Enzyme design. Structure first.
Site, PDB file in Angstrom:
ATOM      1  N   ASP A 136     -66.041  24.761 -13.915  1.00 55.79           N
ATOM      2  CA  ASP A 136     -65.536  23.392 -13.844  1.00 55.79           C
ATOM      3  C   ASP A 136     -65.024  22.902 -15.192  1.00 55.79           C
ATOM      4  O   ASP A 136     -65.278  21.769 -15.593  1.00 55.79           O
ATOM      5  CB  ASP A 136     -66.634  22.451 -13.329  1.00 55.79           C
ATOM      6  CG  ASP A 136     -66.076  21.157 -12.758  1.00 55.79           C
ATOM      7  OD1 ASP A 136     -64.838  20.979 -12.756  1.00 55.79           O
ATOM      8  OD2 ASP A 136     -66.879  20.314 -12.308  1.00 55.79           O
ATOM      9  N   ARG A 140     -62.386  16.223 -18.556  1.00 53.50           N
ATOM     10  CA  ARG A 140     -63.461  15.293 -18.203  1.00 53.50           C
ATOM     11  C   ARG A 140     -64.840  15.872 -18.517  1.00 53.50           C
ATOM     12  O   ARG A 140     -65.815  15.128 -18.642  1.00 53.50           O
ATOM     13  CB  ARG A 140     -63.393  14.935 -16.711  1.00 53.50           C
ATOM     14  CG  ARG A 140     -63.600  16.118 -15.789  1.00 53.50           C
ATOM     15  CD  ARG A 140     -63.563  15.729 -14.316  1.00 53.50           C
ATOM     16  NE  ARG A 140     -63.619  16.921 -13.479  1.00 53.50           N
ATOM     17  CZ  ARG A 140     -62.549  17.618 -13.107  1.00 53.50           C
ATOM     18  NH1 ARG A 140     -61.339  17.233 -13.490  1.00 53.50           N
ATOM     19  NH2 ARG A 140     -62.691  18.714 -12.376  1.00 53.50           N
ATOM     20  N   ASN A 141     -64.924  17.198 -18.632  1.00 54.39           N
ATOM     21  CA  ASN A 141     -66.204  17.866 -18.871  1.00 54.39           C
ATOM     22  C   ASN A 141     -66.319  18.424 -20.289  1.00 54.39           C
ATOM     23  O   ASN A 141     -67.217  19.213 -20.596  1.00 54.39           O
ATOM     24  CB  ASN A 141     -66.420  18.982 -17.841  1.00 54.39           C
ATOM     25  CG  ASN A 141     -66.523  18.446 -16.424  1.00 54.39           C
ATOM     26  OD1 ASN A 141     -66.143  19.115 -15.456  1.00 54.39           O
ATOM     27  ND2 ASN A 141     -67.034  17.228 -16.295  1.00 54.39           N
ATOM     28  N   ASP A 154     -72.050  21.632 -19.186  1.00 58.69           N
ATOM     29  CA  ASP A 154     -72.320  22.133 -17.847  1.00 58.69           C
ATOM     30  C   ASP A 154     -73.071  21.045 -17.092  1.00 58.69           C
ATOM     31  O   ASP A 154     -74.148  20.625 -17.513  1.00 58.69           O
ATOM     32  CB  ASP A 154     -73.184  23.396 -17.926  1.00 58.69           C
ATOM     33  CG  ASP A 154     -73.649  23.874 -16.566  1.00 58.69           C
ATOM     34  OD1 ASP A 154     -72.932  23.633 -15.571  1.00 58.69           O
ATOM     35  OD2 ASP A 154     -74.734  24.491 -16.494  1.00 58.69           O
TER      36      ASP A 154
END
Length: 289
Positions: A136, A140-141, A154
């Site tokens: 992912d 945004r992460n 994570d």
């Protein structure tokens, strides 16, 4: 050893930051028993699952998570197991990189953008070394410790591969289609090389100062357009050299995509002479805190 086991007496959730599929993230304070120090932290409290893991199972996973130690990956510092599972993690005070680049775009120059690309590649290369597939990666992460220093986070999708496993085969559910490699979309296959695809999209997000990929295009149509050979367009500030690295990340053949170790080298070269590789109006006049 690296994982601290906390009692509920040793930390406090102060402020809700957000919620997601696995639980809720808070800003908090960690006051380790007997230590006379107060440490700002992020706390993620996990929602109750239909089939909760045994404490032994949770601790086994947490010890591995806590061992993930790299400047550009957000680290699990401790865990508290009571009625809920609470993960105590490093606090990145400035939020996610996507919002940061949207908010501060008028003052972000080539040096910061290229440095961030290097840091993210270094974090991902470390995860690959640890046999972890993130699954992912997106702007945004990526979280901001300082404007000069970012860390990949994570939130619960990362998977550890066995010593002899080269792929993770996923079991369905909601997926971030517009960041995913074709083989992930079509077959639920995830590898370090599908992470590379997502890295390319993440870099595109940064270089467009937080534009939405394939904006207006339905997620259901994405695999179709990728198969036709369509890809995200060259960001206006990108030289051809930079865009060609991004395009290589989106090759259909996963093994034709760059390795993260190669991405570190290529972006490190560019970060040494940033104005040669990104062209931004007023670049030499910009300033960040």
């Amino acid at each position: 050893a690296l994982l601290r086991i906390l009692k509920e007496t040793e930390f406090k959730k102060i402020k809700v930051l957000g919620s997601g599929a696995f639980g809720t993230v808070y800003k908090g304070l960690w006051i380790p028993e007997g230590e006379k120090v107060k440490i700002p932290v992020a706390i993620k409290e996990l929602r109750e699952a239909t089939s909760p893991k045994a404490n032994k199972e949770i601790l086994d996973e947490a010890y591995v998570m806590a061992s993930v130690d790299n400047p550009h990956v957000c680290r699990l510092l401790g865990i508290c197991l009571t009625s809920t599972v609470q993960l105590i993690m490093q606090l990145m005070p400035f939020g996610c990189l996507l919002d940061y680049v949207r908010e501060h775009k008028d003052n972000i120059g080539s040096q910061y953008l290229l440095n961030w690309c290097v840091q993210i590649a270094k974090g991902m290369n470390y995860l690959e070394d640890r046999r972890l597939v993130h699954r992912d990666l997106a702007a945004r992460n990526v979280l901001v410790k300082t404007p000069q220093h970012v860390k990949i986070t994570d939130f619960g999708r990362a998977k550890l591969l066995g010593a002899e496993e080269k792929e993770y085969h996923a079991e369905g559910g909601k997926v971030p289609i517009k960041w995913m490699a074709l083989e992930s979309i079509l077959h639920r296959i995830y590898t370090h090389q599908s992470d590379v695809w997502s890295y390319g999209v993440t870099v595109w997000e940064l270089m467009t100062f937080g534009s939405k990929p394939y904006d207006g295009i339905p997620a259901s149509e994405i695999s179709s357009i990728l198969e036709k050979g369509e890809r995200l367009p060259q960001p206006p500030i990108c030289t051809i050299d930079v865009y060609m690295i991004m395009r290589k990340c989106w090759m259909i053949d996963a093994d034709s995509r760059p390795k993260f170790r190669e991405l570190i080298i290529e972006f490190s070269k560019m970060a040494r002479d940033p104005q040669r590789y990104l062209v931004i109006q007023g670049d030499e006049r910009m300033h960040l805190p």
